[PDB]
RNA sequence: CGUGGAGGUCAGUGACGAAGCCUAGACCGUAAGGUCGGGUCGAACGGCCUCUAGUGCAGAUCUUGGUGGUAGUAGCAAAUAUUCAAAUGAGAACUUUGAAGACUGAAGUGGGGAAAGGUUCCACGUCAACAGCAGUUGGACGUGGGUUAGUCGAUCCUAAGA
RNA sequence: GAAAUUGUUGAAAGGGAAGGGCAUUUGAUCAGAC
């Protein structure tokens, strides 16, 4: 049928989201294939920097292609005939200190980036370059779908100087910044929620000073914890984080813009940062506009974070970005700032002028194209699934079995032809770009002096349903992203922050799904090879005497045993080197 | 997909462009009533029947 | 607001006012007075009928030169019409009135239209063209309307008889004689 | 109430168009048919199958035929309530001569 | 929908009079989306649009 | 008798309402006019003694502005002609499409230009005002796109002339 | 925010104009009084 009906809404959404064996093996191939990916990048990363000189330092644009084209290597070999949709979920995005995410440069642009920032520099000298300097917090985000099922990898690798005084290649010294306080806060919190999602399968071995038997896991439980880990480490939980439930051809990030009925998850926005500061005075007055936008199934898609309660037979994503705080006297709001392609906006030496390297196709928007180049891109972008891509993936030569300079040239000549079909699509809004954002801290005392004539609440943002419209909530009434930039753009009070982003996928299985085990926790992108911390020393950590903290140490070593009723598997990577 | 979009509307635009057509119409009628009198001024007219 | 003066109790009445509408002032004023004082449910059906030419609007003031019809006999006048456009706006103000009434909590079958008035909007001005190359004003007589519906109160019967009686000294002794006679 | 009919009427157009303006003659027939069918089955909502149109105009504005054989159907109105639940539909019947034919109920099946 | 333009381009692409252009009444939503010549091209060969036959002037009588 | 301004005076009146305006409410004066109450209004004004003048209106086929009666009347009639369905639509005599009927009938109601127009061409949006009925359409309104010459013109030559 | 002019309500009146004058009737409406 052309009509999408209630018969099939049931056949598509609940069915393919049934946990069955045919389904799990698709996820299992993704767990390794993705970890087989990070293990490859990780390899290439240190080969260039940590050890001896291999005759070129790879660049970030360099490592992106090799990474991606490797993740094509592994989808050639699996479900080749069996499955129609197999591809890259999120493109390799290598990020640096102040960058939240969204950074996926094509090869073409290292002379473009270089050019634009030629004048304004010295903060970002790593990003523009592509060469990575020491003492950086570097995310690597990968994801892959097989048959529309997504496994995502995110990890924060710190790079070190190189000490050859020890023949053993020792990364001299620990990481002594408040920087490292972030990555060990996320590394801690990652294990934190890892052990929490085990207790919703059965209320067995669940921390007593916390939940009881009344709630295996609640909307409030997980949220109370992570902000505890934060306030513990004084690391601001980023406004971009979430804990998500996933489906076939439905994942959290795929479309942040397009709406989802029957929404399941924990959400974190700036509308939540006032509630924590505003828990001092308990005033319940909500000043509300009656607008009927995102009205359809508002109940399900409003993203209630209290009503989420963990189930078994669900696939979850844990997404955590924790912004460190260099000491900030007056309390402030943690926000994200967006990076543009136009130099003129700014005379500030600290700005980044760059280009978005990720894209998305909205099947909602239909516009007839007059150009013949932007048409060949359109019917091609539709020859791929519902997930974000860059213009390189679309081509004949992109996997490029034998990598030559002749092939590096084959793609560059194509990128330009696809640049031109990209203009005509991006202006007609048939496709949305991925926001490239920075970590931005703001003083509370700018926003409370705020004087505004009111204005546009109009929908320009990738932000999700409810929270975005006013951004800073109603109790701050009068503020939208626009007046927020204005505030954020009085700059003596502005500052930016390092970030540690961590992505784990967790598949809850009962004893019907996992036989040999009894009820289990499957960690995809959790492999012992991928989750390695880096040398870190921070004086904050581990606040005792809070009933929620003492319950995490109880639960921290609880998942540490094989008498633990829920056995936590870690998918091991694949074998890389073959020749 | 639950996102339901008909709406695009701005009162500021409609209302404030409303006065505009309403002001200038007031000025066009006013250029009419100034000249209404002698609009029919016809020097060097030839009566057909009069002597 | 500030309507034309009302003898109504404001709490029990509803009100609707359009303005600067495009309509014959001379025609809409007529259609008004046809329905003035009526019950609402009534007049509504009536205007409907007129729109089909079952009833008409007697033209009681600006009548001059019109054609005389049978349907006039009803109101006992020979001059009447079916001002189709004039009605659309009255129904409009009637339709609305019914609605503003129900949000105040007033009974829909106890409603009637007490107060209906139409005065003149600023005339609007075009150009027109005549023989010998002259020019004349070409205009409309746009019309203000307001409609105040009342909740029928028949509950008023009040006893007012005020006698401060000055009777003369003669007049007193002469009543005293009628009541001495064992009236 | 009223029930859902069909019939076949011959109409005398010759008499109804008598002495009309040659230029407006045909267009009358259009009105004289809609009026005629609001007579029988006083439905008041009458529609004309464009074939019938080609029948009324086949001879030109001045040349309308003397007699038509017309299939008229009373049917129910849909959605969007019109003042009437009920319908009227006139369309042609292809026939040698309109002459000497009697009104007939065509039994629907 | 307003199909004037589509009928104009039809006469130009087909290269025949607006008299002789047929637009499928049932296709009125699809023809709407034409808006350019090369699109009309597709529609013309597709058969949603058609160049109507020349009316006849017969010389047999003469 | 009154009016616009000046010198003087009532240590005059006034945001607890000044001036103005409305008033089949009162009062003095033959009258010109003064005086009070009510309503409306929101910032300056009045009495006496004197000075001054662009100092008093029913008119002038008076000057500009404003409005009736006439009157929902005159009229909206040349160019042979329109009709049925569907679509769109808060709404269709008039828009779009199909169908049928007709007209210009090659000295055309066709296809191109000069003079003049200056964006009226085209498209997306749109219906307050304009298209002497309508309006979902437009030579209207709002946002934009559109004119590519070694060979077509100007340019050069000379004509009556300047 | 005046007048002309106009709508609504109130009152009043009217056999080919209306309007004024002297005078009192009937209807309204107000001062003086101590
Ligand atoms: Mg005059
Ligand atoms: Mg007369
Ligand atoms: Mg007459
Ligand atoms: Mg004229
Ligand atoms: Mg002339
Ligand atoms: Mg005759
Ligand atoms: Mg005086
Ligand atoms: Mg003066
Ligand atoms: Mg005053
Ligand atoms: Mg008076
Ligand atoms: Mg003078
Ligand atoms: Mg004067
Ligand atoms: Mg005068
Ligand atoms: Mg005069
Ligand atoms: Mg006049
Ligand atoms: Mg007339
Ligand atoms: Mg006319
Ligand atoms: Mg005439
Ligand atoms: Mg004519
Ligand atoms: Mg017409
Ligand atoms: Mg002819
Ligand atoms: Mg002829
Ligand atoms: Mg022409
Ligand atoms: Mg031309
Ligand atoms: Mg045009
Ligand atoms: Mg248009
Ligand atoms: Mg008009
Ligand atoms: Mg109009
Ligand atoms: Mg224009
Ligand atoms: Mg050449
Ligand atoms: Mg030449
Ligand atoms: Mg005013
Ligand atoms: Mg007056």
């Amino acid at each position: 049928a052309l009509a999408i009906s209630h018969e099939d809404t049931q056949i598509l959404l609940k069915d393919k989201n049934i946990l069955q064996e045919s389904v799990l093996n698709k996820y299992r191939t993704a767990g390794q294939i993705a970890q087989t990916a990070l293990k490859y990048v990780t390899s290439l990363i240190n080969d260039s920097y940590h050890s001896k000189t291999t005759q070129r330092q790879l660049t970030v644009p360099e490592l992106c292609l090799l990474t991606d084209s490797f993740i094509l290597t592994r989808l050639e070999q699996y479900y080749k005939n069996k499955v129609n949709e197999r591809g890259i979920a999120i493109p390799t995005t290598i990020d640096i200190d102040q960058i939240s995410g969204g950074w996926c440069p094509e090869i073409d642009d290292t002379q473009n980036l270089l050019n634009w920032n030629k004048g304004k520099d010295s903060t970002f000298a790593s990003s523009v370059t592509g060469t990575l300097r020491p003492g950086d917090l570097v995310k690597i985000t990968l994801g892959v779908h097989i048959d529309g099922y997504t496994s995502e990898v995110s990890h924060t690798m710190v790079i070190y100087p190189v000490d050859e005084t020890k023949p053993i290649l020792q990364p001299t010294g620990p990481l002594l910044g408040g920087k490292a306080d972030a990555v060990a806060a996320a590394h801690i919190a990652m294990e934190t929620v890892v052990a929490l999602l085990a207790c919703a399968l059965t209320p067995e071995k669940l921390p007593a000073s916390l939940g009881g038997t009344s709630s295996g896991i609640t909307g409030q439980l997980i949220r109370t914890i992570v902000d505890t880990i934060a306030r513990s480490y004084n690391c601001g939980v980023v406004p971009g984080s979430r804990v998500r439930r996933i489906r076939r051809f439905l994942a959290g990030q795929n479309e942040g813009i397009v709406a989802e009925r029957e929404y399941k998850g924990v959400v974190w926005t700036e509308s939540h940062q006032e509630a924590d500061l505003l828990s001092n005075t308990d005033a319940k007055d909500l000043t509300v506009v009656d607008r009927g936008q995102s009205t359809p199934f508002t109940n399900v898609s409003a993203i209630p974070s209290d009503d989420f309660v963990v189930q078994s037979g669900e696939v979850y994503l844990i997404d955590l970005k924790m912004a460190s705080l260099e000491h900030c006297t007056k309390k402030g709001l943690v926000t994200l700032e967006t990076v543009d392609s136009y130099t003129g906006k700014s005379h500030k030496a600290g700005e980044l002028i760059a280009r978005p390297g990720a894209y998305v196709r909205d099947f909602a928007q239909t516009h007839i194209l007059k150009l013949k180049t932007s048409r060949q891109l359109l019917t091609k972008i539709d020859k791929q699934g519902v997930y974000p891509f860059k213009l390189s993936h679309l081509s004949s030569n992109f996997p490029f079995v034998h990598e030559n300079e002749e092939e590096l040239q084959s793609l560059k000549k194509d990128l330009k032809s696809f640049r031109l079909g990209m203009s005509e699509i991006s202006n007609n809004y048939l496709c949305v770009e991925s926001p490239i954002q920075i970590a931005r801290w703001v003083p509370w005392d700018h926003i409370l002096k705020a004087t505004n004539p009111n204005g546009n609440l109009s929908y320009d943002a990738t932000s999700t349903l409810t929270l975005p419209g006013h951004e800073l909530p109603l109790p701050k009434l009068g503020v939208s992203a626009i007046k927020l930039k204005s505030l954020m753009n009085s700059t003596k009070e502005s500052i930016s922050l390092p970030v540690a982003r961590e992505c784990n996928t967790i598949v809850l299985c009962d004893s019907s799904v996992s036989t040999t085990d009894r009820p289990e926790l499957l960690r995809l992108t959790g492999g012992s090879k991928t989750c390695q911390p880096s040398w870190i020393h921070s004086q904050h950590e581990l606040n005792p005497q809070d009933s929620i903290v003492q319950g995490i140490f109880q639960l921290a070593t609880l998942a540490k045993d094989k008498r633990f009723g829920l056995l936590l598997k870690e998918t091991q990577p694949m074998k890389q080197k073959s020749v | 997909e639950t996102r339901s979009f008909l709406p695009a509307f701005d009162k500021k635009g409609v209302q404030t462009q409303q006065r505009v057509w309403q002001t200038e119409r007031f000025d066009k009628k006013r250029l009419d009533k100034r000249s209404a009198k002698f609009v029919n001024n016809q020097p060097h007219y030839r009566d057909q029947l009069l002597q | 607001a500030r309507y034309g003066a009302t003898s109504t109790n404001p709490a029990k009445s509803a009100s609707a006012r359009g303005s600067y509408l495009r309509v014959s002032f001379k025609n809409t004023r007529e259609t008004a007075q046809a329905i003035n004082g009526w019950e609402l449910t009534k007049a509504q059906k009536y205007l409907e009928q007129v729109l089909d030419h079952q009833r008409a609007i007697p033209f009681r003031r600006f009548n001059s030169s019109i054609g005389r019809t049978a349907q006039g006999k009803e109101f006992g006048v020979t001059k009447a019409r079916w001002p189709a456009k004039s009605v659309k706006f009255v129904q409009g103000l009637l339709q609305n009135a019914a609605a503003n009434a129900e949000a105040k909590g007033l009974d829909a079958t106890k409603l009637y239209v007490s107060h209906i008035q139409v005065n003149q909007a600023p005339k609007q001005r075009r150009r027109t063209y005549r023989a010998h190359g002259r020019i004349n004003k070409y205009e409309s007589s746009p019309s203000h309307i307001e409609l105040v519906v009342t909740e029928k109160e028949e509950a008023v019967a009040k006893a007012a008889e005020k006698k401060v009686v000055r009777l003369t000294s003669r007049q007193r002794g002469r009543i005293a004689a009628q009541k001495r006679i064992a009236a | 109430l009223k029930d859902v009919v069909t019939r076949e009427y011959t109409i005398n157009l010759h008499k109804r168009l008598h002495g009309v303006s040659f230029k407006k003659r045909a267009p009358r027939a259009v009105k004289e048919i809609k009026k005629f069918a609001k007579l029988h089955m006083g439905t008041d909502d009458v529609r004309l199958a464009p074939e019938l149109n080609q029948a009324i105009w086949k001879r030109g504005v001045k040349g309308v035929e003397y007699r038509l054989r017309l299939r008229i159907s009373r049917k129910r109105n849909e959605e969007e309530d019109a003042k009437n639940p009920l319908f009227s539909y006139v369309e042609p019947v292809l026939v040698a001569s309109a002459k000497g034919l009697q009104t007939v109920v065509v039994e629907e099946d | 929908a307003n199909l004037r333009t589509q009928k104009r381009l039809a006469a130009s692409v087909v290269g025949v009079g607006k008299r002789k252009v047929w637009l499928d009444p049932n296709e009125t939503s699809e023809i709407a989306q034409a808006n350019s010549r090369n699109a009309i091209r597709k529609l013309v060969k597709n058969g949603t649009i058609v160049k109507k036959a020349v009316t006849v002037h017969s010389k047999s009588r003469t």
Side-chain angles (χ1 to χ4, degrees), chain A residues 222-348:
Chain A
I222 314 191
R223 300 194 71 175
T224 267
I225 302 174
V226 187
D227 292 320
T228 322
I229 288 296
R231 181 186 176 177
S232 301
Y233 287 64
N234 124 271
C235 310
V237 153
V238 175
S241 294
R242 36 102 205 274
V243 194
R244 181 99 183 213
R245 179 191 86 191
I246 324 178
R247 303 181 136 178
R248 188 193 182 193
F249 294 101
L250 214 73
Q253 63 185 349
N254 309 347
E255 317 231 326
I257 38 170
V258 143
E260 323 112 351
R261 39 207 275 163
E262 56 217 352
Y263 183 87
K264 189 81 163 173
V266 201
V267 147
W268 308 73
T269 302
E270 302 146 9
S271 41
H272 302 326
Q273 293 197 36
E274 167 111 3
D276 321 337
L277 174 74
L278 214 60
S279 65
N280 285 284
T281 277
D282 287 317
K284 255 194 179 182
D285 288 339
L286 278 172
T287 306
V288 178
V289 201
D290 268 344
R291 297 161 174 234
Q293 293 189 3
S294 82
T295 274
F297 298 99
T298 320
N299 301 335
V300 293
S301 60
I303 325 173
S305 71
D306 192 33
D307 205 356
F308 96 76
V309 167
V310 184
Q311 307 279 6
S312 62
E314 300 213 16
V315 164
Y316 289 103
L317 161 72
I318 312 180
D319 192 325
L320 208 69
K321 340 162 188 169
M322 293 210 58
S324 50
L325 299 181
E326 166 64 355
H327 74 292
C328 304
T329 311
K330 54 178 188 163
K331 271 187 168 182
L333 165 60
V334 176
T335 311
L336 242 27
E337 180 190 16
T338 301
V339 173
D340 321 328
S341 313
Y342 316 94
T343 295
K345 64 170 195 173
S346 175
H347 309 91
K348 309 158 193 174

Side-chain angles (χ1 to χ4, degrees), chain A residues 268-440:
Chain A
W268 308 73
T269 302
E270 302 146 9
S271 41
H272 302 326
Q273 293 197 36
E274 167 111 3
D276 321 337
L277 174 74
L278 214 60
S279 65
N280 285 284
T281 277
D282 287 317
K284 255 194 179 182
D285 288 339
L286 278 172
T287 306
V288 178
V289 201
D290 268 344
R291 297 161 174 234
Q293 293 189 3
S294 82
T295 274
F297 298 99
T298 320
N299 301 335
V300 293
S301 60
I303 325 173
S305 71
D306 192 33
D307 205 356
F308 96 76
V309 167
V310 184
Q311 307 279 6
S312 62
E314 300 213 16
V315 164
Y316 289 103
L317 161 72
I318 312 180
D319 192 325
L320 208 69
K321 340 162 188 169
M322 293 210 58
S324 50
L325 299 181
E326 166 64 355
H327 74 292
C328 304
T329 311
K330 54 178 188 163
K331 271 187 168 182
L333 165 60
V334 176
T335 311
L336 242 27
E337 180 190 16
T338 301
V339 173
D340 321 328
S341 313
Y342 316 94
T343 295
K345 64 170 195 173
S346 175
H347 309 91
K348 309 158 193 174
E351 185 53 20
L352 170 89
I353 303 291
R355 231 164 155 185
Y359 294 121
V360 139
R361 156 75 165 164
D362 227 35
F363 306 72
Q365 341 267 337
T366 287
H367 179 257
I368 316 177
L369 295 180
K370 299 177 180 177
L371 265 71
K372 196 72 146 185
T373 265
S374 56
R375 286 167 167 274
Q376 314 313 323
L377 186 61
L378 154 49
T379 188
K380 267 193 186 181
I381 283 178
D382 253 316
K383 223 113 265 269
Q384 289 192 339
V386 191
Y387 306 66
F389 60 87
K390 61 171 179 182
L391 317 178
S392 311
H393 307 172
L394 322 197
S395 173
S396 53
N397 321 306
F398 172 71
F400 76 108
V401 162
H402 34 281
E403 58 160 6
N404 295 311
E405 307 250 18
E406 64 151 8
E407 291 298 344
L408 178 68
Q409 295 172 1
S410 289
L411 278 163
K412 286 169 185 169
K413 72 203 169 183
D414 293 334
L415 282 178
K416 308 189 168 193
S417 304
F418 287 86
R419 290 289 196 175
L420 193 47
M422 187 38 61
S423 65
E424 169 108 5
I425 308 176
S426 313
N427 306 328
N428 307 332
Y429 309 111
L430 289 188
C431 291
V432 172
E433 60 185 355
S434 282
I436 335 298
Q437 300 157 352
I438 320 184
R440 268 306 185 180

Side-chain angles (χ1 to χ4, degrees), chain A residues 161-181:
Chain A
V162 175
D163 211 358
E164 316 125 23
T165 303
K166 341 276 164 51
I168 314 187
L169 281 189
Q170 182 163 15
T172 172
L175 193 71
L176 299 164
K179 246 187 191 173
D181 214 331

Side-chain angles (χ1 to χ4, degrees), chain C residues 26-157:
Chain C
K26 301 194 166 190
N27 288 340
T28 56
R29 172 275 188 186
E30 228 63 50
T31 150
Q33 299 312 76
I35 67 171
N36 192 7
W38 289 40
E39 183 200 331
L40 201 277
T41 67
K42 281 285 172 62
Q44 285 199 341
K45 190 166 317 169
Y46 170 46
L47 301 180
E48 201 54 282
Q49 313 188 221
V50 140
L51 245 36
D52 198 82
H53 291 251
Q54 267 32 46
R55 315 272 281 280
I57 298 305
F59 269 32
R60 283 182 139 52
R61 183 170 301 181
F62 314 75
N63 22 78
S64 55
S65 307
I66 330 308
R68 315 112 102 235
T69 155
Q71 293 182 337
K73 250 132 67 168
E74 198 184 23
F75 310 94
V77 183
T78 239
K79 222 103 61 85
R81 289 198 148 176
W82 305 259
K85 186 176 191 179
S86 297
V87 174
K88 257 58 161 297
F89 290 63
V90 189
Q91 312 172 288
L93 255 37
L94 279 178
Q95 205 191 64
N96 171 288
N100 284 330
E102 248 82 337
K104 252 175 154 183
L106 290 55
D107 196 354
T109 58
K110 306 207 59 176
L111 274 178
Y112 77 84
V113 33
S114 65
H115 181 77
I116 182 168
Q117 137 190 359
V118 21
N119 42 37
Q120 298 195 10
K123 283 200 181 64
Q124 203 174 357
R125 185 131 185 176
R126 303 149 78 167
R127 284 177 100 85
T128 193
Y129 293 131
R130 318 303 294 299
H132 306 153
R134 290 170 199 185
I135 311 191
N136 305 139
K137 67 158 178 105
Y138 211 90
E139 287 181 333
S140 321
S141 336
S143 306
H144 286 342
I145 304 159
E146 61 195 23
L147 187 36
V148 191
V149 277
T150 300
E151 189 153 348
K152 206 279 182 313
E153 281 315 321
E154 187 193 4
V156 180

